[PDB]
Design a protein around this ligand. Structure first.
Ligand SMILES: O=C(O)C[C@H](NC(=O)c1ncnc2[nH]ccc12)c1ccncc1
Length: 164
C-alpha cells in the first residue's frame, strides 16, 4: 500500500512526506518513532506522532517507563501504533546535540531488522543533530528488511536523492 516512493536499493525506498500523513493513509504494520530514552515525545517526529494520537502515545509511554526504566541510546521498544499503525517501534538514535557517539546510529538501525516492513523517518536527523546524508548511508548499509523512508523537507529529499 505504499505509493509514490523512489526505490534506492533492493529494500530501501524514499519519499518526500510527513510520516504522520503517510501513517494515516497507509496504516502500516509498523511506524518508527524517533524517540529519546525517556519516551518524552515533545517535538520533531515524536511530538507530531504523539499529537496525532491525542496524547495516547505519551500516556502509554509513561506507563512503560514507570515499569521498565529508560531505553538505551541505540535501543528500541515495541508499543501500540494507536490510530496510526498496528505497532510503533520507538527507536533511539544518538542525539549529537547531547554528545552521544554517532557510531550508535548503526545499532539504532539494526532494530529495524526485527520487522519485515516499516514506515520510518531518517534516524538522528532533524533535531537530533546528525548529517542526514550519513544517516541514509547507514540505513542502506544496515537495514535488510523493507524500509519506506518519509523525509519531511523537500530540499533535503532532493539532496539525498541527487547525492545517493
Ligand atoms: O526529514 C527531514 O527533513 C528531517 C527532519 N524530519 C522530521 O522531523 C520529520 N520527518 C518526517 N515526518 C515528520 N513529521 C513531523 C516531523 C517529521 C526535519 C523536518 C523538518 N525540518 C527540518 C528537519
Amino acid at each position: 500500500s505504499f505509493s509514490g516512493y523512489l526505490k534506492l536499493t533492493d529494500n530501501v525506498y524514499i519519499k518526500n512526506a510527513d510520516i504522520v500523513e503517510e501513517a494515516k493513509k497507509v496504516k502500516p504494520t509498523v511506524v518508527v518513532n524517533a524517540a529519546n530514552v525517556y519516551l518524552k515525545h515533545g517535538g520533531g517526529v515524536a511530538g507530531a506522532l504523539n499529537k496525532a494520537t491525542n496524547n495516547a502515545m505519551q500516556v502509554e509511554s509513561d506507563d512503560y517507563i514507570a515499569t521498565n526504566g529508560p531505553l538505551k541510546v541505540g535501543g528500541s521498544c515495541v508499543l501500540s501504533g494507536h490510530n496510526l499503525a498496528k505497532h510503533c517501534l520507538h527507536v533511539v538514535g544518538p542525539n549529537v546535540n547531547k554528545g552521544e557517539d554517532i557510531q550508535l546510529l548503526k545499532s539504532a538501525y539494526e532494530n529495524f531488522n526485527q520487522h519485515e516492513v516499516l514506515l520510518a523517518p531518517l534516524l538522528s536527523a532533524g533535531i537530533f543533530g546528525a548529517d542526514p546524508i550519513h544517516s541514509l548511508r547507514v540505513c542502506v548499509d544496515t537495514v535488510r528488511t523493507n524500509v519506506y523512508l518519509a523525509v519531511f523537507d523537500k530540499n533535503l529529499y532532493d539532496k539525498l536523492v541527487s547525492s545517493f
